Amino acid sequence: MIDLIVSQGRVADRAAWMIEGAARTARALEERYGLKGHYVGEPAPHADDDWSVALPQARETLVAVREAATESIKGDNLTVLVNNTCSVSLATLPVVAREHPDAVVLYIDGHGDFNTPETTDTGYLGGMVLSGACGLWDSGHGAGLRPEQAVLVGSRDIDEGERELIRKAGVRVIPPGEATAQAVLDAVKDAPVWIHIDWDVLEPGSIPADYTVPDGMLPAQIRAVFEAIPAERLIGVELAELNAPADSERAEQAVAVILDMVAPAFDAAAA
Ligand SMILES: [Mg+2]
Ligand SMILES: [Mn+2]
Ligand SMILES: [Mn+2]
Helix, strand or coil: CEEEEEECCCCCCCCCCHHHHHHHHHHHHHHHHCCCCEEECCCCCCCCCCHHHHHHHCHHHHHHHHHHHHHHHHCCCEEEEEECCHHHHHHHHHHHHHHCCCCEEEEECCCCCCCCCCCCCCCCHHHCHHHHHCCCCCCCCCCCCCHHHEEEECCCCCCHHHHHHHHHHCCEEECHHHCCHHHHHHHHCCCCEEEEEEHHHECCCCCCCCCCCCCCECHHHHHHHHHHCCHHHEEEEEEECCCCCCCCHHHHHHHHHHHHHHHHHHHHHHC
């Protein structure tokens, strides 16, 4: 009762190992849950190209992710997308909002990902994902997600202008120190839920973290969110931006922490 879809095509990647991090995450989920992922797109090396160049390059991959996710959303299973970059969600979030106009999108990310072509400082498409899905600029892959239905969770240190774009659109922001499970449940109310996770939301993991207050979200906070959302309300989950080389012990250790965070939701969907 889980559908696993895996992006392996470049979607504006500026990091070297996010396609590889996606592949390793999918492999861990295949082994734990007895699943076989549907792998979409062909890898291409990372580059520092402008969104206006990277976006057309990604069209084939984005269109294929859209069709796979659409079928899954219309079916009876939990839709799980393991995505190299948040930019894959320019294809999926318009489908979520059209199929489930009452869904709340929990966009869990250390960033706001709410830049527009006018406001981006770096030209990076991955900084423009949530604004594109919400129609502030035209990605060519649709929009229709109400900003009033989007909640940024874990975001912090947002550029002043971007923060005002978020505010004016009506996107709520729950910073890591407010992002308890109940705070998230309060934001969702009775709505069905789509969860999008960018792993740079997580506090850089240190061992003796008992005596300092973290700046990012802790894995335990992410797990508590997955424990809190009722399985009957969970539409789907996107896991994005694990930058870890294939065959590395780093990737091995990272996917074990990921599986621990997602287990309450994925175990329930499987059984
Ligand atoms: Mg479903
Ligand atoms: Mn992101
Ligand atoms: Mn981010």
